[PDB]
Amino acid sequence: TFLVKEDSKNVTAYTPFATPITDSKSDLVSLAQLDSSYQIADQTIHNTNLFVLFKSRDVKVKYESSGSNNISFDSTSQGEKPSYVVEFTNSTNIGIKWTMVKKYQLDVPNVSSDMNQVLKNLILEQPLTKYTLNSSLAKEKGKTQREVHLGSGQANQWTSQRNQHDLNNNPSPNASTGFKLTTGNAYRKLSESWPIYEPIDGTKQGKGKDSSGWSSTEENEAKNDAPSVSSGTFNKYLNTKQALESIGILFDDQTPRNVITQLYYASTSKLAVTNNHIVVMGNSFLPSMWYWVVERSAQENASNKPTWFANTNLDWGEDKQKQFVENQLGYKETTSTNSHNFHSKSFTQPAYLISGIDSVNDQIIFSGFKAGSVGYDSSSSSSSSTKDQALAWSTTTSLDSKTGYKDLVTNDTGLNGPINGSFSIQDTFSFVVPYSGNHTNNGTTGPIKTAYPVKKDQKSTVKINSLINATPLNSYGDEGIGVFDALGLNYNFKSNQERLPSRTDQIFVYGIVSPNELRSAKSSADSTGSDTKVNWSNTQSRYLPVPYNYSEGIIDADGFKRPENRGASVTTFSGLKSIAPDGFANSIANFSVGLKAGIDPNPVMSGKKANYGAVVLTRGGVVRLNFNPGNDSLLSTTDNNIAPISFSFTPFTAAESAVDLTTFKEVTYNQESGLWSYIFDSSLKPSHDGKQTPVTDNMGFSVITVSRTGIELNQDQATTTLDVAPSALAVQSGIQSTTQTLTGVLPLSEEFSAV
Amino acid sequence: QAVDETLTPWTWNNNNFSSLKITGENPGSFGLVRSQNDNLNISSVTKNSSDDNLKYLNAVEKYLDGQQNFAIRRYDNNGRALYDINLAKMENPSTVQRGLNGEPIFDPFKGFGLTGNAPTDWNEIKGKVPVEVVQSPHSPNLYFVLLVPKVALEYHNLNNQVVKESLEVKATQSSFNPTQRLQKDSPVKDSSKQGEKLSETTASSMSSGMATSTRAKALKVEVERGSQSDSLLKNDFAKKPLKHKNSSGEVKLEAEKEFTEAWKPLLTTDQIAREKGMGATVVSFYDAPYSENHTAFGLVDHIDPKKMVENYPPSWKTPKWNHHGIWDYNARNLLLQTTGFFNPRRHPEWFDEGQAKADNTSPGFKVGDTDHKKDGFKKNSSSPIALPFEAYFANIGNMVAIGNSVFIFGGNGHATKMFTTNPLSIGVFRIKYTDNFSKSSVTGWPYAVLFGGLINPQTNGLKDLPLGTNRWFEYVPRMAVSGVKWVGNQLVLAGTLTMGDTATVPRLKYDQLEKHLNLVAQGQGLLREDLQIFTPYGWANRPDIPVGAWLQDEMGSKFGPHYFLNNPDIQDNVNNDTVEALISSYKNTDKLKHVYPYRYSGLYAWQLFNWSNKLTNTPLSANFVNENSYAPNSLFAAILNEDLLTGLSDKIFYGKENEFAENEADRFNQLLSLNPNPNTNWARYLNVVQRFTTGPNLDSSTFDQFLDFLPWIGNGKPFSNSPSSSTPLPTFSNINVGVKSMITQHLNKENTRWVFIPNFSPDIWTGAGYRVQSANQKNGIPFEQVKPSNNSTPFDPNSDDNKVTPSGGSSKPTTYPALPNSISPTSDWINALTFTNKNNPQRNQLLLRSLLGTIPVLINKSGDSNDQFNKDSEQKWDKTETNEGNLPGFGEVNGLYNAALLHTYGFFGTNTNSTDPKIGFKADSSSSSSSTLVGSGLNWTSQDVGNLVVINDTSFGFQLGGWFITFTDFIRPRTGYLGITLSSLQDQTIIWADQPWTSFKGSYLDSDGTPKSLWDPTALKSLPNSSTTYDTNPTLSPSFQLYQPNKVKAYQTTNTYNKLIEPVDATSAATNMTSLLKLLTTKNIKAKLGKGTASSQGNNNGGGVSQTINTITTTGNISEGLKEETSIQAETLKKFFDSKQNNKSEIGIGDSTFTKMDGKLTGVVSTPLVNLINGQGATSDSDTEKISFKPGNQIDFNRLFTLPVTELFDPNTMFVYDQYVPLLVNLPSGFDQASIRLKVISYSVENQTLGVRLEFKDPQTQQFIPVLNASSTGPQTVFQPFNQ
């Protein structure tokens, strides 16, 4: 009775004897009367009913700046193949053969006027690739704070001139304002199309947001340097067509389809279910702004529309953290002619790299990395000081902030603008600004002010618009602060050392969403004309950087930094070298996959609901999400100082880090055992390397066992209230092979399992 | 077969085992016994010059087979012996016969079926002594026992020219000088090889930046593979423009010209594997106390050394080498130190050739050729890590059984430990059983591949201990092991553990070896000490700089940025504008690397943090590992993952992922973590630990505040000095030491209000030996402390080497305006992690070695004629700003304060003796002065660890020399509790003995609910000879060290500590200091302290028992000394302790209780009802005298057995029905008939025969017991209808 995905279209029930059932192989794509071009994305079982997520490779979505139906399927070339979620029930005399029960078609979002204004000038960074380089990620440093504000040739006037600029006491005039868009990864509009070539070096190569420039000659030069199967020198670019295909980007011959189509087809990735609702969110590889919520009572022939993540006012834990996230989207009082951006139209974080979606006890749990979105200038001319430049900045908490998580996260450091850069502390260096609030080299001088990097005299002549990053790295600046933020290196010098939470970079978003607020989300999706927001109260965010051990040169993380860490070879993204063994080519950008909530099988106090904790995989460690089943909300403790109990990160070892994260196929939870299992199918690997060399290790499989650990909630009278976050523990289970093609693992029993 | 009273019960020193408590179906004791006879003349076995150790050891074993007998007798649950089991003498032994399902054939009254023939290997096993016993957790009547050669006991009594120390005392006829064993002359620039030095960067990339600088450019390091077979095209790490001194020939590590009588093991790892009589053996066996066939054997397995050595990591084939290779190898060899990570110069106990391979040459890699491109390739190896005889028996003992398997965690090392040699448990063995115990397999693995998963989240104590590792297992953990036991549901390990080396992490400037003799001797294997020793002024700016850069400023007149003297007062401010000029221009590649123009320096914690193997948040996270500890230097206990330990494979498989780099171009881009090649399994082993602990649940300066609270076992006084203005000051903490300093003028003046303290006023106690302009200027110090190279004037601030030009040309100086108030080795700085000298490794090292009582003290003056140092008018505790406060500041033990340590020991004043001994240290300002370390006068050592005992479902503890220690809260922690409790020994006749742990006779949990320990003042032993005919100025003993001279310039009379005290040539100093060199022998310390003979008085004998302090739920609660709301946590803990110095018992600190006994103490035997000392004190079972089975003439058989026996009992549990109990058992009037019943143990319905055992409610325990006196055949009987 174990339903296993035979291929991209067939699912068959296997008997506990690991033997297929007679006449049980079923073609679900045809069973649902969907053309063969369709395929199944993810499947879930809920009340012995099998649901399926159907995403077709023929879909073609078009975006139009003008008009009302801005996001709509391209039916001109029979490309109107929306994605479906279909409920399948075994309805017979007890013999496995599935049948149509209901079929819900997921439609593209309706774009309100404000979302339209934002999307017209919006641009999306090309997706992160398995074969992606640090240097590739890296973007040349932008105009410094002083350069943007005071202009050029205004040195030693900072002190004097800073007062009228609402930057009082600002200690870092050389603070980066962002990253120039003139080069690097391809930033394309929704109506545009990504390239298959990724620049090796993002400081030199690539044409960035200038699509006309890229297509004029740089595209041809990159094609010459990087051919498609070698004969290519591969000195400036990588031909990542195979990897783009692998992680789910659609291709017309060779050129990928438009960004809106790619984003939609990526958004149809996963499936979590409830007795009244069905939620679909995007995969982990590339962002997804919109997620469909399906009402199980909705008509069969009716239309299901998603909710903009921009309309989902998540609770990041603190209003201060929420406003951190909000303030980096872009300038507020644009007023140029139409230069509206996410912050100006009063929208929240628009993109999440959704790690996974799951439900338990009628509750839906979601997790994922906050996908960076920031303003950028498109003045095109004299010209704006910040022209062609991203407006982003690292927001690490200062060195003297009060000890404690709450205090850390609530620290005013980078409220509105850039303050971090380079500084000297005794016999070491701190890229983090040493001061916050009103602290200085002679006493107290007044509050430290920060402002958005945009000159006021040009308030009406600066065209600011938003962008969406392909990774959690909000600020791409090829700078020390950036690297530090990325790598989780920032530490305070006090008696009790603490990691400084970068409130706007590498942010990890997780939470549990309840049916009432899911209904509110569905209402938001239904909203026509005026855009209505969604409130998600039971959510939290945690600074979750990539482990520092994945980057060459960095041996440990502590307040005292070794002098060689100041060298350009570790200070910059471009100079950074990756030793990542988890299949990633980069060691900067974090990535999460495989959220699977589960019910704790262990006995609980009478009158107390059984514990259910969810485990999510990340780079270099597992993450356990702790919940309070008594209220079906996040686990929390009264003492602020303590890190949010809801969070618990347990690092990996050589065996777990060796497990490619790009190969996550399926995750199963053993209800009676209480142990997860993370199936990794090596076959998922792209055909060809980023340098067009054939992939030599596309054969095999591996699994990771995630076992609850620590002290759980409501165990006994003495454990009614907790102070220590329950911590998961990942171990390389022992189900590994390189010569075999995985078909499926069977949770046969407590004591046994089949491969 | 029957009991022989001539064998007496005893405790083996290596595991402290004496008996096993049997539990379940038939409780009782197994316990070790030996023959009582004296006059054991082992020296009657002649050793010739023309023969090897093996035939000598066989002659000693054959001789001892005539002179001594050994056995493991069984006792009942009241302490009464049943049968003898002298394995050398028992008649016609057999293995057990099996059914077709592998089960042993059995019936309780008959016993086991015997095959009629002995086990395999019986002719070589029968001479071995049994030394540990354990019971199966799942299978009834099934046990395991460990056997060893008799020399695994008697090794200490074998003759001294074969059982040598690792060092020699000699005749001392030239007078004693500890520098005579030390290679000491420094290296020099080669007059014919200057041209190959690392090149200055001629042009540096703009990176679209604007700033600029005048300072000398970065040094390049280029490395690439080329096209030639065995040469790179460039290899700039291999450059070598320095060479050694030619003082009567070349100075370098060269064993064949230095070890003229080299130490080597008794037997090699290959000999112990092939010579089946010399290896250790475990056997399974079966026992039933009231059967005809009461005992018989299962299976035999040798604990084969090749099953350990062939499971060592690939890097252990080349312990002369490490993953950095060539540049580190050359820097070490130039400084005359060890190369690799576990070389036999420090650790000979694991090498088959001992000191004969204690050299830097032939590392398994090509090195030392005339072309730098030719070095750095793999070749053949001839000195791998092994398991020779001395290390082997320290790796044996401490058994546990889990599932169908049994384990061996190794001993404390007192099978084979000598005064200067440290064999330890380096791993774990397992024997695994198959085909329902019809077959077996044997294996083992080193702790390095098991403990590598440790992380900062897995302990409630201190963070960042030197327990980290990486993909190469160059951190080599080993333990003196206290034991392994079940603490309720959790399996636990305990003992003392080796960190990585904390002491030798700082590295000398190349020319200065002649003036820093202790740091080089501690790196040479000569000073076998793990305590951190303060030596800052001679250190290089950086340990890791490639040796081609060291010659960039020979005059010091430029203060050469890449290589210079370590002092922190003179280094860069690299601000908002500066980094783009001086350092952020030098971008580099897959074939280029650089050395940067940044000036760099710091004190001991900077050096230690930078290149020690500290734990982090991540495991496998230590790309630098300086070396490994000589002896255990940490406490340890941990929770061990028992199902994962059951599920790990017998064979461990490694691959190219654990090999060192085959060439230096692949070493240049060296990945710190890599994928296991998926056939391999080595990475599975890392997850055997769930949790670990190392000391109190305390953090930061609070742990130094705890170090001062405990009493010193030499006199019972606390280290705190506060229970009595000219009063003395504490040694470990800083509270009330020096003056309250406002840190508001620290840093570059950069930011110091609300930063570092929980209160509005940032007051910190500045400690001893601090620097100020005046008492009115007690807040910070301005920059004025400039150092010349010669008389060559100031460091020159505002010069072009101390400036940059930023964007817009607005130049500013790159140097500090103000500095911290202290550099001294006692320093605690919350705000300055680079000027603080205290560290978390040292906090745990001090905890262990202050418990053992053997931290050394630094001396200028002895009690001898005209040499004396005084309490009055010669020390000024109130004036620690000047030399009159006598702070050394050079050669001193790290973290503590020497004058306070000397005072707490009572080396001056009437603290520890009835008159002033006048020994100590004085800071003179009139002339240059000489110094060396000496011991505390006590003789305990960190291997002196006894039985792990489990007190209840969460609490456990062990004996550790003069202490019992308890880890009361480790399994279930709480806030506001310190997590440790301690009880001191009181007996001065034990504490001042010369080998004191030999008086401990074992430790056990007792029936009144307390752990207890046995002591015998008659069991002590003298040194191996009485010094024969001469005064042995060096006397090898368990608290001796070859502490070297440190020599220094005169102290300044005022502003004394404003600069570090300047060192001078010590190579000639030994002739000026003879009174101190005589005090290196700890017997002379005892003589001058008045402790050296019968002058201690008190008990003439007085052996007996010791017991830990009473305990309750309040014990160890310190919740008012934890947290903060008005000051800093150590300062409020000091306030909380100072009202409690007279009442330490509620903190869980104090002296043990003790009771005397007459005659010898030899060992306990223990069982669930009772503990018997020497096996005496057995009882009549006084609670059960009235309970007995009915005899056969009192039973009317047809009244019982008209019914078939099939229905006299419940088939689901085999208990006889309640109404038939008084029909078979006699009981007293008014007795509770529910308190007792009969269990069926065998029957046959075709014979109507029923065999039974009785079970009764114990008045003492909430569990059932057998009634031992219930028949003339014990608790088991049979009933049948007249047909027996």
Numbering used by the authors:
A (entry chain A): 27 to 255, 261 to 412, 416 to 789
B (entry chain B): 59 to 782, 789 to 1348
What does the publication say?
The P140-P110 heterodimers form the ‘tight interface’, while the ‘loose interface’ is formed between the two heterodimers.
(c) Top view of the surface representation of the closed conformation of the P140 (blue)-P110 (yellow) heterodimer. Intracellular signaling, likely at the intracellular region of P140, then triggers a conformational change within the P140 stalks, changing the angle of the heterodimers relative to each other and thus transitioning to the expanded conformation where P140 and P110 do not interact at the loose interface.
